[PDB]
Design an enzyme around this catalytic site. Structure first.
Site, PDB file in Angstrom:
ATOM      1  N   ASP A   1     -13.989   1.415  -0.667  1.00 23.10           N
ATOM      2  CA  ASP A   1     -13.380   1.656  -1.970  1.00 23.10           C
ATOM      3  C   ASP A   1     -14.426   1.587  -3.075  1.00 23.10           C
ATOM      4  OD1 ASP A   1     -10.956   1.980  -0.738  1.00 23.10           O
ATOM      5  OD2 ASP A   1     -10.214  -0.031  -1.207  1.00 23.10           O
TER       6      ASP A   1
ATOM      7  N   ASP B   1       0.844  -1.191   0.000  1.00 22.54           N
ATOM      8  CA  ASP B   1       0.000   0.000   0.000  1.00 22.54           C
ATOM      9  C   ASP B   1       0.881   1.243   0.000  1.00 22.54           C
ATOM     10  OD1 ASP B   1      -2.006   1.845   0.174  1.00 22.54           O
ATOM     11  OD2 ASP B   1      -2.692   1.263   2.175  1.00 22.54           O
TER      12      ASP B   1
ATOM     13  N   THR C   1      -3.441   5.844  -4.580  1.00 22.05           N
ATOM     14  CA  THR C   1      -2.510   6.801  -3.995  1.00 22.05           C
ATOM     15  C   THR C   1      -1.065   6.505  -4.375  1.00 22.05           C
ATOM     16  OG1 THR C   1      -2.385   5.504  -1.953  1.00 22.05           O
ATOM     17  CG2 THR C   1      -4.056   7.236  -2.070  1.00 22.05           C
TER      18      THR C   1
END
Lengths: 67, 80, 521
Positions: free
Chosen positions: C389, C53, C86
């Site tokens: 999400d 992530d 991101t």
């Protein structure tokens, strides 16, 4: 094993003579099925599956941040 | 440390064989390290091992057999 | 030649800020994509963690340099809009700074560089609107396929079949035609242990996280009830000023007990006069919220009480139910209460969850509550975050309509058109338009690198067929090659790429505008 796997898939054979392993007591090649050395399949399948997932986790590291 | 946690995963599933699993993962890293010097990207090295693992399980199916040679001869007596 | 020397060298600060900021995204490039490599981080406490992530890496990185801390706010603003991706927004900024570093090497002042990225970003968004494929909220089939294929990268692929339309219909309640900013906080996801993933319900009213009275006389259910938020605390009298209680007698101890029960009763009577059937007490860890003696009094009054109400729920209950928080018992009135058709405690295999229905208020607006069930505790955790999400992907289509097949396809369409627009520019800008378009190619280049594919071969082959075909040429990992990304169900909504370029323009701007750093105490 390489010589025994030549006539095996062709479904035509003179003599198969596969499954020869290592006998370390007498130092010679014998049939492990006749020698009595057997391991359950669940041991060998999960071994290659666990050893691979551990090897992948190492190969996935391109960076290490050490405080 | 992954190898240490690997022994924990091996003890909680089969319970034995942690010695052979570590030796396998050690040689696979040495073989993959030479592939990096061969200009092979590690992502395909990962996928290349997973594809070989899918066939390896299928190849064991032609290896594995049920209980045999207990009639007409004894292979179990060599164990005792 | 011979030009302005600049004996004092502020450029060393801007050059160090770019190098320190590019070093941030260099490690982020490895985690890009589903095949991206994981990164190792040792926290200051000494804990060793691993994950792909990008937002988690920047969170646990413990960044010191302030300019590198700005990329955390860029990834945070990217999560506030898109909620996913991101990793790409940090990589996009890393290349624009590397391209701006070459612009500084050509003798271009960063103010012109920052202003050139403004016209570059504002026009690239307009270019992104030209390639937009517009969808509609009236078509649920496109919304289901968008949420289902986006969740195929998550541990549970199979149950996304029933999860996709639930996530769609939950947003369609807040998707009402004309709206600008559609908040997802109006949709509350409540996770409870028990059941399976196949069991999920969209409630027409608010649902709490807490049970009902455990002590003697708990009603656990009430019909046609009034609800209110009490910020007061029901306790035996404890004056903060100087007090004195002298008990010389055995009967005086009973007078003290009856006096404390009378003070609790008077508080319970004032609640009964307003006819408030359901009470919600704000969580207070200082002292006890409601005494057990007061619970027995409210049990006789047939008043359902639910304590340990978090402040996060209070702001959510005051919206859907349309109620108002009440500070004290003297401020407790009927006008500040709610109206509820049914208030009950739903127990499914040891669940005992409490839900509220029948808001019946004029302040009622698109507030939605969703209950999540599952066997293991690790299920209801990740499954909830996996739905947020899906809530953001549809939210992007509601705010900015239309979606575009991803995989490097929209980045090449922009880089190709800016190559032609660079010939139509004038002056110093025309050289920046070429460097800005080349800095956009880092996204399709990194995807080919993290997937093991040949860098040059894939990037050139994509741009090769991109001169004929337009938006269907991108990287496909499922096919292990270059093919149509629309048939592979890889879809990236426009707002994700719209905000990514906008945040990248302000980031790089705020960086190059810093010519120096001074310690100020």
């Amino acid at each position: 094993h390489a010589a025994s796997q030549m006539a095996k898939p062709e479904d035509v054979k003179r003599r198969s003579y596969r499954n020869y392993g290592l006998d370390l007591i007498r130092g010679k090649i014998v049939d492990e099925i006749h020698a009595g050395v057997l391991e359950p399949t669940i041991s060998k399948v999960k071994s290659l599956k666990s050893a691979l997932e551990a090897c992948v986790a190492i190969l996935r590291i391109d960076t290490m941040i050490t405080v | 440390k992954i190898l240490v946690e690997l022994a924990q995963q091996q003890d909680r599933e089969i319970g034995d064989g942690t010695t052979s699993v570590v030796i396998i993962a050690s040689e696979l890293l040495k073989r993959a390290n030479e592939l990096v010097k061969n200009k092979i990207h590690p992502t395909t090295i990962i996928t290349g091992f997973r594809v070989a693992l899918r066939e390896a399980i299928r190849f064991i199916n032609e290896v594995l057999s049920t209980s045999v040679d207990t009639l007409g001869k004894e292979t179990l007596i060599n164990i005792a | 030649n011979a030009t302005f020397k600049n004996k004092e060298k502020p450029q060393e600060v801007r050059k160090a800020n770019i190098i320190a900021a590019r070093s941030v995204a260099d490690a982020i490039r490895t985690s890009l994509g589903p095949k991206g490599m994981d990164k190792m981080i040792k926290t200051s406490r000494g804990e060793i963690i691993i994950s792909n992530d990008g937002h988690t890496i920047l969170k646990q990185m413990a960044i010191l340099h302030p300019v590198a801390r700005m990329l955390v706010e860029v990834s945070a603003a990217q999560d506030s809009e898109a909620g996913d991706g991101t990793t790409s927004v940090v990589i996009l900024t890393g290349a624009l700074l590397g391209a701006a570093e070459r612009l500084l090497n050509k003798g271009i002042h960063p103010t012109i560089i920052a202003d050139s990225f403004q016209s570059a970003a504002k026009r690239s968004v307009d270019i992104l609107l030209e390639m937009c494929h517009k969808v509609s909220l009236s078509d649920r089939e496109q919304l289901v396929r968008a949420a289902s294929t986006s969740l195929s990268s998550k541990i549970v692929s199979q149950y996304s079949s029933f999860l996709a339309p639930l996530a769609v219909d939950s947003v369609l309640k807040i998707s009402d035609e004309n709206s600008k900013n559609v908040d997802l906080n109006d949709i509350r996801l409540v996770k409870k242990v028990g059941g399976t993933i196949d069991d999920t319900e969209m409630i027409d009213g608010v649902v709490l996280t807490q049970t009902a009275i455990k002590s003697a006389g708990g009603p656990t259910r009430k019909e046609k009830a009034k609800i209110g938020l009490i910020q007061f605390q029901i306790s035996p009298p404890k004056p903060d000023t100087e007090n004195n209680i002298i008990v010389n007698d055995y009967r005086q101890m009973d007078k003290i007990l009856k006096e404390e029960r009378a003070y609790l009763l008077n508080i319970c009577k004032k609640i009964k006069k307003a006819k408030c059937n359901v009470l919600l007490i704000q969580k207070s860890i200082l002292r006890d919220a409601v005494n057990d003696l007061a619970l027995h009094f409210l049990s006789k009054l047939n008043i359902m009480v639910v304590k340990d109400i978090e402040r996060e729920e209070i702001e959510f209950l005051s919206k859907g139910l349309g109620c108002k928080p009440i500070a004290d018992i003297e401020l407790f009135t009927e006008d500040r209460l709610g109206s509820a058709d049914l208030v009950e405690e739903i127990d499914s295999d040891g669940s005992k969850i409490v839900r509220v229905t029948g808001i019946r208020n004029n302040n009622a607006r698109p507030t939605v509550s969703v209950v999540i069930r599952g066997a293991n505790n690790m299920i209801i955790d990740e499954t909830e975050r996996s739905l947020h999400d899906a809530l953001c992907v549809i939210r992007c289509l509601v705010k900015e309509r239309g979606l575009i097949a991803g995989g490097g396809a929209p980045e090449i369409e922009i880089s190709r058109r800016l190559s032609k627009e660079a010939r139509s520019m004038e002056g110093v800008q025309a050289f920046i338009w070429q460097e800005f378009a080349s800095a956009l190619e880092v996204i399709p280049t990194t995807l080919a690198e993290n997937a093991g594919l040949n860098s040059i071969k894939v990037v050139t082959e994509l741009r090769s067929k991109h001169e004929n075909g337009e938006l269907n040429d991108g990287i496909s990992v499922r096919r292990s090659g270059t093919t149509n990304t629309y048939e592979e169900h890889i879809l990236q909504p426009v707002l994700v790429s719209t905000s990514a370029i906008t945040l990248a323009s302000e980031c790089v701007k705020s960086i190059l505008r810093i010519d120096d750093i001074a310690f100020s105490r």
